[model samples]
Target: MSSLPVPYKLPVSLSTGACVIIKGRPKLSFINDPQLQVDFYTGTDEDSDIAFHFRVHFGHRVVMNSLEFGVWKLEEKIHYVPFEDGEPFELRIYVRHSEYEVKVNGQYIYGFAHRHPPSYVKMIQVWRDVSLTSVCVYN
Candidate 1:
């Protein structure tokens, strides 16, 4: 699952219209509570402030939140997933004026409203139960 690195840090500065595309498959697809996590950080270090946190619990749901000034803020979650067990999935996170749009396999999922400006992101980390195929950004 760490083939793409657990703390897959990619320094980035997002702007409106930026799209972060992630592709991977669930590494623990048959296990209970298999999950995939992605985070947007304000620094390259893992312990730095998190601009956004996205975690996908396979077959169940996804949870999202932000850690601002070292405090975890309101948690947001949704009980829906478009992934089939053991299937490869494509995830796209688009930065906009007001929020980050999440899409899985091209299906628009949720929008996590902006609590921190997208440009504040200095790193994007992909972790946990995923064997990542690629991570790319386009604007």
Candidate 2:
């Protein structure tokens, strides 16, 4: 999951909610011998919802995934989706006012909304068991 956080800015006179989309090329089957893998998560924030998660993966095509919307009250956990058996692909994550939409190969695979707010997110990380690449924070 070699990743580098892009330099993004949030509006000062913006609403309570906002969205962001993350896109990048992926490694071939980084986990479970799958083709591709993806994970989108927010850093630890008081108003951050750990339950709502969004992820997308592609092998030959987009394979396994999940998207949960609403205020989910659950302990923080790491969740991700897997592609096929072997092959590399591209990935993208989009965040809206309340939802974190994920896409692969230019396809919308899942939409995950947070119960709280993104303002609480202090930092964002993109990494994997294979490699930990980049980290980004909104100012």
Candidate 3:
């Protein structure tokens, strides 16, 4: 877990908020189960402003994990990709001036704007609700 390399992109503009949701069955370490979920949220207080969380539910046979590249600021940024075996989808995120350019399967899915600075985004996390062999983060 600690050996994996970081894959975080700096923000180009301020954004209000952003969320990437994924739906998939784990293939790594788990069995029959329900769908998995991963989330990233901004801290309401000042101490734990930048935060990353990953959870796995056993009832649905979910195995979750996360990886952080660097420290972040009060600003928040999160990316989630859910998929099961035989499932295929693309998640793309681009950092431009004033907004985050996001594309799914080569198609424009969303454009997220930042409310905070990009410098806070120094860590890249790869987590899962269901266990997975690998995760791909596109530029």
**Which numbered prediction scores highest in lDDT against the true structure?**
1
**lDDT agreement of model 1 with the native:** 0.87
Candidate 2 residue-wise lDDT, 1-139, digit = tens: 5555433222221123333333444444544432223333243443433333332333223322222343434433324444333333344544467765655455666755555454444343343322223322222
State the C-alpha lDDT per candidate. 0.87, 0.38, 0.37
lDDT of 3 at 21: 28
TM-score of 2: 0.44
Model 2: per-residue Cα lDDT at residue 124 = 38
Give one digit per residue, the lDDT tens place, for model 1 in 58-119. Answer: 88888999998789999999987698798889999999999999999879899889998888
Sorting all predicted structures by TM-score, with the top scorer first, yields: 1, 2, 3
Better of 1 and 3 by TM-score: 1
Query: Candidate 3 has what TM-score?
Result: 0.40
Q: Which ten residues in a row have the lowest lDDT in candidate 3?
A: 5-14
TM-score of 1: 0.93
- The model with the greater TM-score, 2 or 3, is 2
Q: Candidate 3 at 45: error in angstroms?
A: 15
Q: Mind giving the per-residue lDDT tens digits that candidate 3 earns over 1-139?
A: 2222222112222233433323233434435443333323332222323333334343333222222334532333334333334444344445555765555445564444544353444333344334333344333
